[PDB]
Design a binder for this molecule. Structure first.
Ligand code: HEC
Length: 108
């Protein structure tokens, strides 16, 4: 484990063909296949603006952090067994660390 930080614009071009198909991260961004992500960092799992999660995502209530959300992205299915996050998981750490650097820099 060594968060060798990436580039917020590599994380952007990654996000744009990994997560944008289901999620939003600008604060005007409507919820869709999943919630918005703008303000997840420092929240618990399951707290977007009036949006209904799963029983498993709620009973998880993970404090979304730099390290803690990187764990979840490695295998979201195992981390929240029953999650609506149909995705699969970002196997490669380097490619995660870029996306983290973006999503963080889209929250502050
Ligand atoms: C559509 C098939 C999805 C893709 C592609 C990605 N995500 Fe996802 N995510 C999805 C859902 C429907 C949910 C809610 C799960 C539930 O069962 O209620 C989520 C949740 C997240 C969260 C947590 C939000 C919160 O707890 O408030 C994060 C931080 C998140 N997702 C990040 C994320 C990233 C960065 C993705 C690209 C690698 C990505 N998701 C793809 C659905 C889908």
């Amino acid at each position: 484990t060594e968060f060798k930080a990436g580039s917020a614009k590599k994380g952007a071009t990654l996000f744009k063909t990994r997560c944008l198909q289901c999620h939003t991260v600008e604060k005007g961004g409507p919820h869709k296949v999943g919630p918005n992500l703008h303000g997840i960092f420092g929240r618990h799992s399951g707290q977007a603006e009036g949006y209904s999660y799963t029983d498993a995502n709620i009973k998880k209530n993970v404090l979304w952090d730099e390290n803690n959300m990187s764990e979840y992205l490695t295998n979201p299915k195992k981390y929240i067994p029953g999650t609506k996050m149909a995705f699969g998981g970002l196997k490669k750490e380097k490619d995660r660390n870029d996306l983290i650097t973006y999503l963080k820099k889209a929250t502050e």
